[PDB]
């Protein structure tokens, strides 16, 4: 029985969120989490596929579109993520 999708809230720190996004070339996967960052502390990991931002599906979007969805939410973001194998 596979692990379920989950919601992770991250607040931007002085040095940003501390996660990055890269296509695996479908949806964006969380990558390059900075040690000691809000991303790490909130429970993101580097096989998380981002499927929604702030309740909005990002499944049809490219890198620029996912980035924009996140940036326009100000200084926090609410991600729905699920495991990529
Ligand atoms: Ca914008
Ligand atoms: Ca703009
Ligand atoms: Cl940032
Ligand atoms: Cl990024
Ligand atoms: Cl941002
Ligand atoms: Cl913006
Ligand atoms: Cl905008
Ligand atoms: Zn989906
Ligand atoms: Zn980028
Ligand atoms: Zn771009
Ligand atoms: Zn870019």
Swiss-Prot record:
Modified residues (Phosphoserine): 14
Location in the cell: Membrane; Cell membrane
Tissue note: Expressed in kidney, liver, small intestine. brain, lung, and testis (at protein level).
Domain PDZ: from-to ranges: 7-85
Taxonomic superkingdom: Eukaryota
Protein family per UniProt: Belongs to the NHER family.
Subunit description: Interacts with PDZK1IP1 and ABCC2. Binds to the C-terminal region of SLC26A3. Interacts (via C-terminal PDZ domain) with SLC26A6 (via C-terminal domain). Interacts (via C-terminal PDZ domain) with SLC9A3 (via C-terminal domain). Component of a complex, composed of PDZK1, SYNGAP1, KLHL17 and NMDA receptors. Interacts (via PDZ1 domain) directly with KLHL17; the interaction is important for integrity of actin cytoskeleton structures in neurons. Forms a heterodimeric complex with NHERF1. Interacts with AKAP2, BCR, CFTR, SLCO1A1, SLC22A12, SLC22A4, SLC22A5, SLC26A6, NHERF2 and SLC17A1.
Recorded domain comment: The PDZ 2 and 3 domains seem to be involved in the interaction with SLC26A3. Interaction with the C-terminus of CFTR could be mediated through independent binding of PDZ 1, 3 and 4 domains.
UniProt function note: A scaffold protein that connects plasma membrane proteins and regulatory components, regulating their surface expression in epithelial cells apical domains. May be involved in the coordination of a diverse range of regulatory processes for ion transport and second messenger cascades. In complex with NHERF1, may cluster proteins that are functionally dependent in a mutual fashion and modulate the trafficking and the activity of the associated membrane proteins. May play a role in the cellular mechanisms associated with multidrug resistance through its interaction with ABCC2 and PDZK1IP1.
Further remarks about this protein from its record: Disruption of the gene was not associated with abnormal growth and development or redistribution of interacting proteins. However, a modulation of expression of selective ion channels in the kidney, as well as increased serum cholesterol levels were observed.
Protein name as annotated: Na(+)/H(+) exchange regulatory cofactor NHE-RF3
Organism (species): Mus musculus (Mouse)
Source taxonomy: Eukaryota, Metazoa, Chordata, Craniata, Vertebrata
Included stretch of the parent chain: 238 to 323 of 519
